[PDB]
């Protein structure tokens, strides 16, 4: 019993974090092989007025860099720019580089943040990509370069390099190809993120997990078909329900099918009571996450 937003064990990523320092800027970077990935605003003169990145890259001097893994300092061979990242060649190879891939995450997918400061991991926690391409995290100054990852059968998929905090407090990264999530700019401009909508397949996984935990006051008697729900969904801040097979196991263990949850989702969208600790509907648990905390295989 119990439901906790969890992270995967961080060990295979901890040894990849380095400190990247240029001038008076200092942030984190990701050291894979003989190259270090880090956000490009480390080379701006100021980060409170709009930055011209093509200028900053032209007047850049490698000797101005300071990159370190612990108290071992690495030397900078070359530096190229890709999207919002810098790719920094270094004269030292990371013997601890894990088997890795890059992946861009879609909304509703869960991953892990290794929150780093001054080149060292400080915390690990799981997040979920929202529809507005933001995440609800805990990052302060110095946190940029903090990677998001998933571990898959022994491969580390890197999907996120932290970049900025919007005026709302929501957090934005790029993927490891350099492309910002959601087309946001790495500028200190007033940016307002779009409406967020709940990834309803995760909301179902969460309601099932609540029914297993023995929470059942919210269940409803009526039932609505998937297609009817989908045309209500898009006007009430929820995504459409596409794949129903994912839940094929939860119903068995609960005796309540999706159609019963869909009709229940329409009621809660509510009245002072709680579900598994939550006061409104959350979309931050994937089905594969709930499967593990309820069963394990």
């Amino acid at each position: 019993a119990g439901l906790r937003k969890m992270a995967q064990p961080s060990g295979v990523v901890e040894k990849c974090i380095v400190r990247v320092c240029y001038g008076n800027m200092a942030l984190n970077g990701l050291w894979l092989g003989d190259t270090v990935m880090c956000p490009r605003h480390v080379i701006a003169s100021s980060t409170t007025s709009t930055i011209d990145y093509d200028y900053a890259l032209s007047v850049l001097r490698l000797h101005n860099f300071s990159i370190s893994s612990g108290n071992v300092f690495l030397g900078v061979v070359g530096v190229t720019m890709r999207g919002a990242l810098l790719q920094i060649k270094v004269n030292q190879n990371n013997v601890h580089t894990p088997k890795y891939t890059y992946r861009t995450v879609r909304p509703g997918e869960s991953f892990n943040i290794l929150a780093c400061y001054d080149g060292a991991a400080a915390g690990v926690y799981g997040v979920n990509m929202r529809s507005n391409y933001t995440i609800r995290g805990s990052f302060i100054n110095g946190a940029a370069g903090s990677p998001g990852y998933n571990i898959n059968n022994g491969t580390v998929e890197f999907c996120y390099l932290h970049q900025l905090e919007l005026g709302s407090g929501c957090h934005v990264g790029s993927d490891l190809d350099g492309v910002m999530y959601g087309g946001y700019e790495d500028q200190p401009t007033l940016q307002v993120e779009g409406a967020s909508s709940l990834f309803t397949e995760n909301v179902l996984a969460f309601l099932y997990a609540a029914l297993i935990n023995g929470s059942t006051w919210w269940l409803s008697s009526s039932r609505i078909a998937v297609d009817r729900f989908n045309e209500w969904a898009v006007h009430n801040g929820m995504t459409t329900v596409v794949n129903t097979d994912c839940f094929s196991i939860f119903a068995a263990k609960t005796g309540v099918d999706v159609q019963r949850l869909l009709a229940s989702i329409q009621s809660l969208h509510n009245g002072g009571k709680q579900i598994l600790g939550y006061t409104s509907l959350t979309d931050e648990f994937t089905t594969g996450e709930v499967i593990r905390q309820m069963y394990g295989v």
């Binding site: 605003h41 932290h162 900025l164 200190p188």
Partner: peptide, 6 residues
């Protein structure tokens, strides 16, 4: 509020 590069 302006966005904060971190």
């Amino acid at each position: 509020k302006l966005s904060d590069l971190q």
